[PDB]
Amino acid sequence: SMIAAYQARCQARVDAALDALFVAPREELQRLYEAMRYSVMNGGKRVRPLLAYAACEALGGAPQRADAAACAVELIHAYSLVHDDLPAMDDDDLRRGQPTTHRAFDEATAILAADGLQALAFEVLADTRRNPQEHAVCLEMLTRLARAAGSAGMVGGQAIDLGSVGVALDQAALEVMHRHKTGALIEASVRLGALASGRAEPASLAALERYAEAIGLAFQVQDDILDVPTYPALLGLEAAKGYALELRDLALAALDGFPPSADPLRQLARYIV
Template identity: 45%
Template sequence: MVLAEKKQNSLSLERKMKSDIELINSYLDKYLEIRYPHVIWEAMRYSVLAKGKRIRPVLMLESAKACHGDINNVIPAACALEMLHCQSLIHDDLPCMDNDDYRRGQLTNHKIYGEATAVLAGDALLAYAPQVILNYTPESVDRKILLQVLDEFLKAAGAMGIVGGQVVDIESESKEIDLNTFNYILMHKTGELFKFAVRAGALLSQAEEEKLNALTSYGEKIGYAFQIADDILDVTGTLEEIGKTPGKDHKLKKNTYVSFYGIEKSRKDLENICESAKKILVDSGINSELLFNIANNIVMKAVK
C-alpha cells in the first residue's frame, strides 16, 4: 500500500473520530489551563496538546458508547489517560532513555524546555492525571466504580503496568530474551493503557460483565497489535508518517516484534490479531463501527 493510500485511510478514520477528538482536546485545554508556575504548565500543555491521534481516549469514549453510557462520566478519565500517555512519551524521549528529538511531528519536550523541566513536566502530568479523575468525574458516578477505575489507572501507570514494561525493555536491550519476556514487554509497555481505555469506558457505563470481558479482550489485542504496527513502522516508516525519528529501535538494539519474527511474519500476525479483535466485537454483539475501524486502520498503516 503506497503512502498516499495509507494517508487517505488514516484521514478517513480521523474524520469519523473527529467529534471525539475535538471533545477530548477541548477538555484537555480546560484541565491544563495555565497556572503558576507558568513554565511547568506550559511544558505540560506543549506535549499534551500537540497533534496526536488520541487513540486511547477515543477507545474509552467509544467503549462507553458501545455500552450505552453517559459520555460526561467518561471524559475526565479519558483525558487523564491521554495525560498519562503523554507523560510516558516525555520521559521516553529523554537522552537517558530513547534520546529522541521529535515526537508527534514537533521537537520533543526536552528540546524546548530542557531536560530538567521535561522530567518535571512528566512528573506533574503523572500526579495530576488521577486528580482529574477524582475531581472532575460527576458525583452521580458510583464511588465504588470510580475507585475501581482509579485503582486500575494507577496500576497501569506504575510498576505493574507501563513502568514495569519499560524497565524490562531497557534491561533487555542488546540481549537475547525468551518469548515470555518479550510478551511481557509488549503487554505492559503498550497493552496496559489500551486495556485500561476500554475497561474504564465499560466500567463507567456500568456494563454487564460479559461485555466488559469482551472489551477487555479486544483492548488487549488492539494494544498488542498497535505495538507490532509501531515496530514495523520503525523499520519501514518515515518521519512524516510516524512523527518521530524512524530506526531508533534498531539503533538502540531493542527487542521488537520485527527483530523477533521479521517483517513478513510481523505483518501477517498483525492482520490476524486485528481480525481476532474484530471477531470479538461481532461475537459479543458489540455494535461499534469506530472500534471495528480502529482495528482495520492499525493494519492499514503498517502494511504496504
C-alpha cells in the same frame, strides 16, 4: 472512513477537555503549566481517548461520560513520553519535528511538568465534577489506571525494556515487554471507558479486555511492519503481517454479540492492519 471521522470527533472532544486543565493558578507557575501544555497539546492522535470513548459507546453510554477517562489516559501517556524523551532515557531532541519538552524548556522543567501530569491524571478521575460516575466506579477507574500506569504496568514495561538491552528477545519475552509497556494502558483505556458507560457488567468487561489485549499487540506488530527486536525481524515480514491479521480477528471475535454502537471498536481493529 467512519473510523477517520470518529477519530476526529474524539480528538476534538478530548483536546477541549485537556486544554482546560493547563491554567496556572498563579503567575509563578506559568512556565511549569506552559511546559505541561506543550507536552500534551502537540497534535497527538489520541488513540487512548478514542478507545475510552469507543468502549463507553460500545456499552451504550453517551461519550461525554468518558471525558475524564479519556483525559486521564492521555495524561498518563503524555507524561510517559516526556520522561522517555530525556537524555538518560531515549534521549530524543524532536517529536514530530518540534523540540521535545526538555529541549524547549530544560530537563528539570520537563521532569517536573511530567510529574505534574501524572498527578493530574489521578486528580481528574477522583474529581466527581469532572468524572461524575458512582463513587465505587470512580475508585475502580482510579485503581485500574494506577495499576496500569505504575511499576506493574507501563513503568514496569519501560524497565523490562531497559533490562533487555543487548539480549535477543524471543517472541514470548518481547510480548511480555509489550504487554506491560503499552498493553496495560491500552487495556486501561478500554476498561475506563467501559466503566464510564454506567452499564458495565463482568461479561462485557471481560470481552472488552480480550478486545484490548488483541488490539494493543496489533498496534505494535503493525507499527513494526510500517517501520519496514521487532516483529518482522523475529518472524519475517510476511509472518508478521499474518500475525497482525490474526490479532485483528481475535479483536473482532471478542465483540461477538455487541450491538452496532460497538462499530467504532470493530472499525479500529480493521483499520490498524
